[PDB]
Design an enzyme around this catalytic site. Structure first.
Site, PDB file in Angstrom:
ATOM      1  N   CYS A   1       0.661  -1.308   0.031  1.00 14.99           N
ATOM      2  CA  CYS A   1      -0.093  -0.221   0.017  1.00 14.99           C
ATOM      3  C   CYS A   1       0.873   1.249   0.170  1.00 14.99           C
ATOM      4  O   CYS A   1       0.736   2.120  -0.686  1.00 14.99           O
ATOM      5  CB  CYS A   1      -1.058  -0.075   1.425  1.00 14.99           C
ATOM      6  SG  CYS A   1      -1.952   1.296   1.464  1.00 14.99           S
ATOM      7  N   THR A 353     -18.104  12.371  -2.635  1.00 12.45           N
ATOM      8  CA  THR A 353     -18.235  13.823  -2.272  1.00 12.45           C
ATOM      9  C   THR A 353     -18.022  14.834  -3.516  1.00 12.45           C
ATOM     10  O   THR A 353     -18.572  15.670  -3.679  1.00 12.45           O
ATOM     11  CB  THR A 353     -17.521  14.034  -1.146  1.00 12.45           C
ATOM     12  OG1 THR A 353     -18.036  13.504   0.111  1.00 12.45           O
ATOM     13  CG2 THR A 353     -17.072  15.305  -0.836  1.00 12.45           C
ATOM     14  N   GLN A 399     -10.202  14.494  -5.603  1.00 13.07           N
ATOM     15  CA  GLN A 399      -9.058  14.958  -4.811  1.00 13.07           C
ATOM     16  C   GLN A 399      -7.786  14.112  -4.908  1.00 13.07           C
ATOM     17  O   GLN A 399      -6.843  14.584  -4.980  1.00 13.07           O
ATOM     18  CB  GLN A 399      -9.414  14.884  -3.373  1.00 13.07           C
ATOM     19  CG  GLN A 399      -8.723  15.298  -2.157  1.00 13.07           C
ATOM     20  CD  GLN A 399      -7.344  14.556  -1.920  1.00 13.07           C
ATOM     21  OE1 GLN A 399      -6.211  15.125  -1.687  1.00 13.07           O
ATOM     22  NE2 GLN A 399      -7.285  13.060  -1.612  1.00 13.07           N
TER      23      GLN A 399
HETATM   24  O1  LIG Z   1     -16.188  11.138   2.126  1.00 14.62           O
HETATM   25  C1  LIG Z   1     -15.939  11.324   1.054  1.00 14.62           C
HETATM   26  C2  LIG Z   1     -14.861  10.356   0.320  1.00 14.62           C
HETATM   27  O2  LIG Z   1     -13.588  10.863   0.540  1.00 14.62           O
HETATM   28  C3  LIG Z   1     -15.142   9.688  -0.852  1.00 14.62           C
HETATM   29  O3  LIG Z   1     -16.642   9.865  -1.253  1.00 14.62           O
HETATM   30  C4  LIG Z   1     -14.521  10.352  -2.121  1.00 14.62           C
HETATM   31  O4  LIG Z   1     -15.092  11.756  -2.312  1.00 14.62           O
HETATM   32  C5  LIG Z   1     -14.769   9.556  -3.336  1.00 14.62           C
HETATM   33  O5  LIG Z   1     -14.031   8.379  -3.204  1.00 14.62           O
HETATM   34  C6  LIG Z   1     -13.937  10.198  -4.593  1.00 14.62           C
HETATM   35  O6  LIG Z   1     -12.679  10.161  -4.515  1.00 14.62           O
HETATM   36  P1  LIG Z   1     -11.884  11.275  -5.010  1.00 14.62           P
HETATM   37  O7  LIG Z   1     -12.311  12.751  -4.746  1.00 14.62           O
HETATM   38  O8  LIG Z   1     -10.271  11.058  -4.872  1.00 14.62           O
HETATM   39  O9  LIG Z   1     -11.975  11.267  -6.442  1.00 14.62           O
HETATM   40  N1  LIG Z   2      -0.876  -7.806  -3.352  1.00 16.73           N
HETATM   41  C1  LIG Z   2       0.266  -7.695  -2.678  1.00 16.73           C
HETATM   42  C2  LIG Z   2       0.308  -6.128  -2.167  1.00 16.73           C
HETATM   43  C3  LIG Z   2      -0.687  -5.433  -1.840  1.00 16.73           C
HETATM   44  C4  LIG Z   2      -0.606  -4.021  -1.358  1.00 16.73           C
HETATM   45  O1  LIG Z   2       0.354  -3.760  -0.490  1.00 16.73           O
HETATM   46  O2  LIG Z   2      -0.969  -3.183  -1.891  1.00 16.73           O
HETATM   47  C5  LIG Z   2      -0.238  -8.171  -1.160  1.00 16.73           C
HETATM   48  O3  LIG Z   2      -1.467  -8.536  -1.011  1.00 16.73           O
HETATM   49  O4  LIG Z   2       0.523  -8.812  -0.454  1.00 16.73           O
END
Ligand SMILES: O=C[C@H](O)[C@@H](O)[C@H](O)[C@H](O)COP(=O)(O)O
Ligand SMILES: N[C@@H](CCC(=O)O)C(=O)O
Ligand SMILES: O=C[C@H](O)[C@@H](O)[C@H](O)[C@H](O)COP(=O)(O)O
Lengths: 649, 649
Positions: A1, A353, A399
């Site tokens: 991640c 959002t 965002q």
């Molecule tokens: O409470 C709001 C969350 O943050 C979520 O609803 C977000 O608005 C969407 O996942 C869109 O994500 P992006 O704004 O990054 O495109």
């Molecule tokens: N797919 C890998 C990496 C996932 C990640 O950390 O984004 C795992 O589960 O180990």
């Protein structure tokens, strides 16, 4: 991640300092959530750093980074005081997908018991099943249930089957990614290429930070295909920071390179080159500061990002609004504002959002551009194969700038020749690069789980764009001035709303035990209902629903009784009378609602028990003030119920 | 609201034959308003009916009509045996959208403490506050808060300042309407004008039924301007029926006169004069063997669907012809956008057919909620085609959008279920969905008929595209098979009733669908809101990951819709997300969806149809589910609380 690697080339660092840097790097990635983490670094205790470059040690553990930091310093056979003139350390936080959280399934994943190759990975390898079968037939034994391990075993397969004894680390990785399918951000390390790093991505962010007290050879790295690389000129000393998020780099340097899909970035002899199977990658300066990702005196990131909204709104308008002569200039649209005005329709595409920001500005966009404005949810926009044309302007609010459905909506419209505009808050993000032009809402990083300052910064950005689209219309000069004086006064008005935090806690204690709440409103505040009810859903886990007021008499009004909590929004705009009508319809059915209204609406304040009284602003800006009490209500309700507002869930 | 009056001229009726005709007329109109009721007839207990037309009695009580039918009877002062040869009686049921539904606010209103003028009003007077202050100064005392009283205190003010001793009842009413603003439908009665009635309209329906065993003098009453009246030739026997709707008159006769705006009808000496056959069978408004209109109207959808396609769909040669559009179809294809405007369930029908309209017309399709469409002053152009969906053809917001669009030169199309309704008249062209009268407050057959209609329109817009011939064939075969497949769904009534026993106690439920079934989950959520009073909310499956998913645990009831179309996989991903949050959802799926049926306990297995028709089938279970849930909770499905049918104010 989360990914972070720190390469110090001829910048002496003790093993203690190297490990502290890796841990500190992961601490900046924790906010994305994770279940395990690990680090990889050169082992051994030979005082001459040159002889320890053939022993890679790993420390992986299931749990929080702190537990990892404790396990690092809790090693008896490890001397932290050795000094490395050159060294590459890598780190990783894992969000398990393939394999349960465990030390074995944590990163870095190794290629064998001697750790000849290790790799950290963000993403998923779709064809890991086949790849695993092929490597098992060639005589490689796996130890983890992770798709990531196939990468470590595969790079060793290419190394073991190299035609020449001196094939480059880069060539090896090229052959690996050419066999991988899916999304991945990768950083490699090998005893056979000591001090060297290789980074590559496909569908996952990867950036490189750089720092040196010496001049660098360039600020624009050219691509090399199968004078040309980045390095300090007169001396060797240089530091590189591979990361999947700028937040882990900014405290060391603001000079970063955002890699693109299929880029293979390599550091060899302290020199950074980018290969690919005259285009180049820029070394750019980020306006991000470490203070923007720290809680400060606040108890949570949610609290900080709500209460700093007077500041974030100002950061959104800086260099873009001139209150001295009532003019608006979004630099990001200078070379495209002309074409956009010759177009015949606007389409706002977003999720969650971000989509509500479209609804919150649809009317004023229609008013000032006089063009059709269609607001679409990205996932539904894709399901229907919506008609799109060359003379359409398509905005993509996001965002992160990486949301998949929004991104796929972007690429959909590009194929049909529409003009694409990105409204993002993440430099280098996919939506900011692939749009023809865009605006960075410059609200600062959003570390909280929920969108608070990003919603209001998007709101302001779209209003400013609307102001640009009518800067030539005599009949609208007054309206533009009214709006821009409102923006001039908005930050002070937001403070005024936050100063009622106490009044909101009282409302929270009144809804503490409630399971449902209906939030009603129309016109400029339809979006306020939806966004409010989304926040209370996401943060409080209670059933909050947004109901368009004009729709009550068509069914929904049946929920109103003396038990159903109701929050109504009644502001001083042209829909005031209609909102009063809705209030009478509710009260007529034993409803006892809490009303958010203007400070001076003496009538409703007397006839309604509990009222949240916000200051009056321009009709097309009230949405920003009327949504903040709902942000705070969701915050206080969660606190009262013992929830962690910074926990994803 | 509803209006009904019974004028018998030289047709001896006892005082019980009249009160049971007024109540029986309100029962036919109850579904338009049931918060209160009232009747107005002649009092006194003189054998000679002539010495009783100087005394007016008003029996008004709170509640439905059955609360008034018992207040009329078991009274100790009214002798229900007096034989009247000439008599007039007015009745009214009210929709108390404001204030309390008290007998003082109910109609008929009065002008003083002796009942010289009583009026029943359907509509709103937009200046009753100015009329109330002008009348209070001259010496008139008001009693109620309704806007109808200012019509009674004013018809007496024109009678107290007339110029001649015998000014016709028409002249007095003509002076009143000149001072009233807004819409209204009135039926007067006065002691000074015994047996005389006056019926004027302006923006609200109002017709006059007539019955007489004798021949009628004419069949075209000429409108007059300040061989003319409709009356029996040789004798005087005639019975009139003032009523705002046709159902209250079809039981007594099928000979009505649909008035027009500013037409002042007046019955004098039993002669109908205006100043300035029905195509419905009684069976269509009878519950039959069902215990409720809503149950009937659901189970009759196999027939209402066929009645929508009758004389319009030919399955031998695969041709679609909507007569109402033959003269405009050519010009509609030269336009550049489709806009659907409606409220509530009708708006859902637009959502349910948007995708296919985009597919077959290749035009932009934009679906708008009328109330919000007006609040934003949406851009509309001469090359726009604007559809207006309305079972009643009288919904105020929808109707105002129509006039808004006509003013901007757009081509308007009405999709109605009421012939002669405002929307069917004021549109350039339109289609009558021909589903039959809808008595249940919740639209059930109207939704599925509007659905089919918009699909038939889509089939016309593409009957000249070679590439779409096969797609057209696929859809029309689906229509041929649809009635039987609806029957296959209704056969699962018992199975639906069971799952209702597992949910009737819950407070909330979430209904999730995407694509063609986004509408399904919204319409289902609306129905459950409207008649069961549960907090049901429709949620777009693609939006779960963006917040609302946080509201799902093992306790929260969830209904998902997963059909075999191009969104199957995406719906499967949403289902896996729900289970991960410990949800235990009911899944509406296709019978052949074995993978889904095995892994999910509670399933509702509906037969497979064409993707763009599947919505008609997946919504019927939610119609039934809402029904059974209401029965379990002890409610009435034909008279939900807090509203009525058709929002005309
Ligand atoms: O409470 C709001 C969350 O943050 C979520 O609803 C977000 O608005 C969407 O996942 C869109 O994500 P992006 O704004 O990054 O495109
Ligand atoms: N797919 C890998 C990496 C996932 C990640 O950390 O984004 C795992 O589960 O180990
Ligand atoms: O179930 C609810 C009702 O059916 C409601 O949603 C209805 O659709 C509107 O109140 C007006 O719609 P019409 O104009 O079609 O009557």
């Amino acid at each position: 991640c989360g990914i972070f690697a720190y390469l110090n080339y001829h910048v002496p660092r003790t093993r203690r300092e190297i490990l502290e840097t890796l841990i500190k790097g992961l601490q900046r990635l924790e906010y994305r959530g994770y279940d395990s983490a690990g680090v990889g670094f050169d082992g051994g205790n030979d005082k001459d750093w040159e002889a320890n470059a053939c022993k890679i040690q790993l420390i992986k553990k299931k749990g929080k980074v702190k537990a990892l930091d404790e396990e690092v310093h809790k090693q008896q056979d490890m001397d932290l005081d050795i000094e490395f003139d050159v060294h590459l350390g890598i780190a990783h936080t894992r969000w398990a997908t393939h394999g349960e959280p465990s030390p074995v399934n944590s990163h870095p994943q190794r290629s064998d018991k001697n750790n000849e190759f290790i790799v950290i990975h963000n993403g998923i390898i779709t064809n890991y099943k086949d790849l695993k079968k092929f490597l098992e037939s060639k005589g490689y034994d796996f130890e983890s249930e992770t798709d990531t391990e196939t990468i470590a075993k595969l790079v060793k397969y290419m190394y073991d089957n190299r035609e020449s004894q001196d094939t480059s680390f880069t060539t090896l990785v090229e052959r690996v990614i050419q066999q991988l399918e899916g999304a991945f951000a990768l950083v490699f390390k090998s005893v056979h290429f000591p001090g060297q790093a290789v980074g590559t991505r496909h569908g996952s962010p990867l950036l490189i930070g750089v720092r040196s007290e010496h001049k660098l050879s360039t600020d624009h790295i050219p691509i090399l295909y199968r004078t040309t690389c980045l390095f300090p000129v007169e001396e060797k000393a240089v530091e590189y920071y591979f990361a999947s998020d700028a937040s882990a780099v900014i405290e060391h340097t603001n000079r970063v390179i955002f890699l693109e899909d299929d880029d293979v970035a390599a550091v060899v002899d302290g020199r950074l080159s980018i290969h690919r199977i005259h285009p180049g990658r820029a070394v750019q300066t980020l306006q991000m500061e470490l203070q923007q990702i720290m809680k400060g005196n606040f108890s949570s990131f949610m609290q900080k990002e709500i209460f700093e909204q007077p500041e974030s709104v100002v950061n959104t308008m800086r260099g873009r609004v001139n209150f001295d002569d009532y003019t608006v200039n979004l630099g990001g649209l200078k070379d495209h504002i002309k074409e956009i005005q010759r177009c015949r329709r606007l389409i706002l595409i977003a999720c969650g959002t971000s989509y509500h920001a479209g609804v919150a500005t649809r009317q004023v966009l229609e008013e000032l551009t006089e063009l059709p404005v269609m607001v679409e949810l990205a996932s539904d926009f894709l399901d229907r194969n919506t008609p799109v044309f060359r003379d359409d302007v398509c905005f993509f609010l996001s965002q992160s700038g990486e949301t998949a459905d929004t991104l796929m909506g972007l690429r959909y419209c590009k194929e049909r020749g529409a003009l694409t505009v990105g409204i993002t808050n993440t430099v280098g993000s996919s939506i900011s690069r692939e749009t023809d032009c865009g605006v960075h809402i410059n609200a600062g990083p959003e570390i909280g789980v929920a969108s608070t300052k990003a919603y209001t910064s998007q709101f302001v950005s779209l209003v400013m764009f609307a102001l640009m689209m009518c800067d030539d219309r005599i009949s609208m000069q007054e309206r533009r001035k009214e709006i821009m004086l409102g923006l001039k006064r908005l930050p002070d008005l937001i403070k005024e709303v936050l100063s009622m935090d106490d009044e909101i806690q009282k409302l929270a204690t009144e809804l503490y035990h409630q399971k449902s709440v209906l939030i009603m409103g129309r016109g400029y505040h339809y979006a306020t209902c939806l966004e409010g009810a989304l926040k209370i859903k996401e943060i409080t886990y209670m059933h909050s629903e947004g109901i368009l007021a004009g729709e009550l008499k068509h069914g929904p009004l049946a929920l109103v009784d003396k038990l159903m909590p109701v929050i109504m929004i009644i502001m001083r705009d042209h829909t005031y009378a209609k909102c009063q009508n809705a209030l009478q319809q509710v009260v007529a059915r034993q409803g006892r609602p809490v009303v958010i209204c203007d400070k001076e609406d003496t009538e409703t304040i007397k006839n309604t028990k509990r009222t949240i009284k916000v200051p009056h602003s321009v009709d097309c800006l009230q949405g920003i003030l009327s949504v903040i009490p709902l942000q705070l209500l969701a915050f206080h309700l969660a606190v009262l119920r013992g929830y962690d507002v910074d926990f994803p869930r």
